[PDB]
């Protein structure tokens, strides 16, 4: 029902080794569609999903120009951050930004985002009201006073209620066949002997979109979420995802364990067991 | 689509 668009900024300073590196990636839900790297030869915004290639030449030039301007913008940010914290000009530091929007079934804005981190810690974030800012410390409060006087949030709100949702709707339609159709996971349970009295049962999910998934092992009907080994959901590289869940079980009791699979593409939640 | 944010710290 709901969808989202995100842009991810990474600015990394490297004293002596040139200018700061600026990188940008765009996602619609869990699909990458656009990218930019400042260290590319003739740097510009590139397509990463076939449905974005439909966009005209005016799009790519303006997209590229924003990215090239950002390289300058975030070079200023990094230097300003140094003075704000009394840090030396010889250290490598990171600034991150995530911004985008969430839409409902009607294509309306659910909520908007504009969040900043410095060296992995919260710096400044746009409130859900799209009018005020949350500073994580006193250094970021300086930015907050700057941004309140300069009426920054207005620009944010204008984009999120206007261009953000408008462009997302266009992307969702142009790539409806992949973005709006969910891919069901292919599931199976494998058997791996460890000792004489202990075997690992591994519950697989393969080729699913979107990434959102829940895999829980159950014995006799009770949640085994403490004795479950769980790996992070991982990209297959073909835009679909992978995940598995493991549980060490006694020999001859494999039939007593159940794997519950929850995913958007599944008409009903699946329950699986080891097939001897 | 992106938008340009020229505002800094």
């Amino acid at each position, epitope marked *: 029902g709901s969808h989202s668009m995100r842009y991810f900024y990474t600015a990394m300073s490297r004293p002596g080794r040139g200018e700061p590196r600026f990188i940008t990636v765009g996602y619609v839900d869990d699909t990458l569609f656009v990218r930019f790297d400042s260290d590319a030869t003739s740097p510009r915004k590139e397509p990463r999903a076939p449905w974005i290639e439909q966009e005209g030449p005016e799009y790519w030039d*303006r997209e590229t*120009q*924003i990215s090239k*301007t950002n390289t*300058q*913008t975030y*070079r*200023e940010n990094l*230097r*300003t951050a140094l003075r704000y914290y009394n840090q030396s000009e010889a250290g490598s530091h990171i600034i991150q930004r995530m911004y985008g929007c969430d839409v409902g079934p009607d294509g309306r804005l659910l909520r908007g985002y504009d969040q900043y981190a410095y060296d992995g810690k919260d710096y400044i974030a746009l409130n859900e009201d799209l009018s005020s800012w949350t500073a994580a410390d006193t250094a970021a409060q300086i930015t907050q006073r*700057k941004w309140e006087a*300069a*009426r920054v949030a*207005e*620009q944010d709100r*204008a*984009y999120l209620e*206007g*261009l953000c949702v408008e462009s997302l709707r266009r992307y969702l339609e142009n790539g409806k066949e992949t973005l709006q159709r969910a891919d069901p996971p292919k599931t199976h349970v494998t058997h791996h002997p460890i000792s004489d009295h202990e075997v690992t049962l591994r519950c697989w999910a393969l080729g699913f979109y979107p990434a959102e998934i829940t895999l829980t092992w159950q014995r006799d009907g009770e949640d085994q979420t403490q004795d479950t080994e769980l790996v992070e959901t991982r990209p297959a590289g073909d835009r679909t995802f992978q995940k598995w869940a493991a549980v060490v079980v006694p020999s001859g009791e494999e039939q007593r364990y159940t794997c519950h699979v929850q995913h958007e593409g599944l008409p009903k939640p699946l329950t699986l067991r080891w097939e001897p | 689509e*992106e*938008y*340009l944010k*020229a*505002w*800094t*710290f």
Partner: T-cell receptor, first 111, second 112 residues
Framework: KTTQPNSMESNEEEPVHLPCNHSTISGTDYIHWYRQLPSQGPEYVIH???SNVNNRMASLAIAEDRKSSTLILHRATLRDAAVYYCILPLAGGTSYGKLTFGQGTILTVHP | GVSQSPRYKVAKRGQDVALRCDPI?????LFWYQQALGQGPEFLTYFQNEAQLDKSGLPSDRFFAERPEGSVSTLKIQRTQQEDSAVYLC???????????FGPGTRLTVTE
């Protein structure tokens, strides 16, 4: 890129309305106004985006469709006689704050 | 505020001149503009701290600009020509997009 009138006359102690056209404005562009008094460096007056902004000397009024705006001086003095520039510094998402003035409305305030 | 020296400079054609700008302390952004008579100011070059990141407004490679320590800025015009005659304006801001504070300008006149 903005267009504005060639000149404007007004009496002192009376309000001045300085109009500006910007029909190609991006939904995220800022409207800025600067001014230059005779034989002096330019100076910032006001800026805004969608809703009207207030000072005790100058106000900015932006149209609903955002295609035009107005610089309102409330109590214009002889000192206010200047050139007034209407600028879109971001230029539709292509520039960083560097100012393009470039052709403004010459003020005359009459005693 | 921002200051500039000298107020006025009369120069013989072919000689080199130096235009100095002392910006407001703690301002990252520094702008130079050129104002030829009967016109608005025109962007010359930009400084982010000590870094000259945009010089697309400079008329020729005779215009040499520097801001070595991120503060005081110098615009050197080598071998001055009649066309260089104008007011040169220095502006500094708290950051690239914030309000620019202008100096009183340097009036240069190049004579034969």
């Amino acid at each position: 890129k903005t267009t504005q009138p060639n000149s404007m006359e007004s009496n002192e102690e009376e309000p001045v309305h300085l109009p500006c056209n910007h029909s190609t404005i991006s939904g995220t562009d800022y409207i800025h106004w600067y001014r230059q008094l005779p034989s002096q460096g330019p100076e910032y007056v006001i800026h805004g985006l969608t809703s009207n902004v207030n000072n005790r000397m100058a106000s900015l009024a932006i149209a609903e469709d955002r295609k035009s705006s107005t610089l309102i001086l409330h109590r214009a003095t002889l000192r206010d006689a200047a050139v007034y520039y209407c600028i879109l510094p971001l230029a539709g998402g292509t520039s960083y704050g560097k100012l393009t003035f470039g052709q403004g409305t010459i003020l005359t305030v009459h005693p | 505020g921002v200051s500039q020296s000298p107020r006025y400079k009369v120069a013989k054609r072919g000689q080199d001149v130096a235009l100095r700008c002392d910006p407001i302390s703690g301002h990252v952004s520094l702008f130079w503009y050129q104002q030829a008579l009967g016109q608005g100011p025109e962007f010359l070059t930009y400084f982010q701290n000590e870094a000259q990141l945009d010089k697309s407004g400079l008329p020729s490679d005779r215009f040499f600009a520097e801001r070595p320590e991120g503060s005081v800025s110098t615009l050197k015009i080598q071998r001055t020509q009649q066309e260089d005659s104008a007011v040169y304006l220095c502006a500094s801001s708290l950051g690239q997009a914030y309000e620019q504070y202008f100096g009183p300008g340097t009036r240069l006149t190049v004579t034969e």
